[PDB]
Symmetry: C3
Subunit: 68 residues, 3 copies
Amino acid sequence: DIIWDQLIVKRTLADLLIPINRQISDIQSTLSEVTTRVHEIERQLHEITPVLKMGRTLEAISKGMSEM
Amino acid sequence: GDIIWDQLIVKRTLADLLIPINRQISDIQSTLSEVTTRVHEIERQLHEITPVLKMGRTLEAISKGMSEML
Amino acid sequence: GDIIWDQLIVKRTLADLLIPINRQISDIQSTLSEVTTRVHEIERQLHEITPVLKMGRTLEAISKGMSEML
């Protein structure tokens, strides 16, 4: 009787939640795809930040030698 | 409609509890899409900039070979 | 009021089902915020690196115009 009332709300709610679970599963995979793309970008920027720091010091040391 | 009535009011009662869940989700779906287009714009800017630096380092390597052996 | 004992039993079923949904969401909200700050840090690092490369390509375009003059 109250066990029916619970079963009813459980199944009414689980069918309402099928779209919510689908919406979430697609967000979890799309969020994981972005996190690996951002991991690949940060690595690609950590290997090209030094060469530009070397380039700006070469610009600073050639400015000091042109003054002489 | 006796228990069928019960099930139908329970559905629209359970739909009320879910309208914050649906709003929380819709804001995540738009914010996740905004990030995915910003990350798409970043990766193609980096895919344009990675080759010219690879060409630059080979020009530095081939210049080093011709300089010390001259 | 026995309608309070009914609600208390019912509400445990709703809680049982949405607790994982709320936890799934809260972990997405924090993980989505982490990537939005990482993407904000990447865009400002690229906004400071994009001008120096546009200055470099115009220096390459100016020297090409000067080499034509001989």
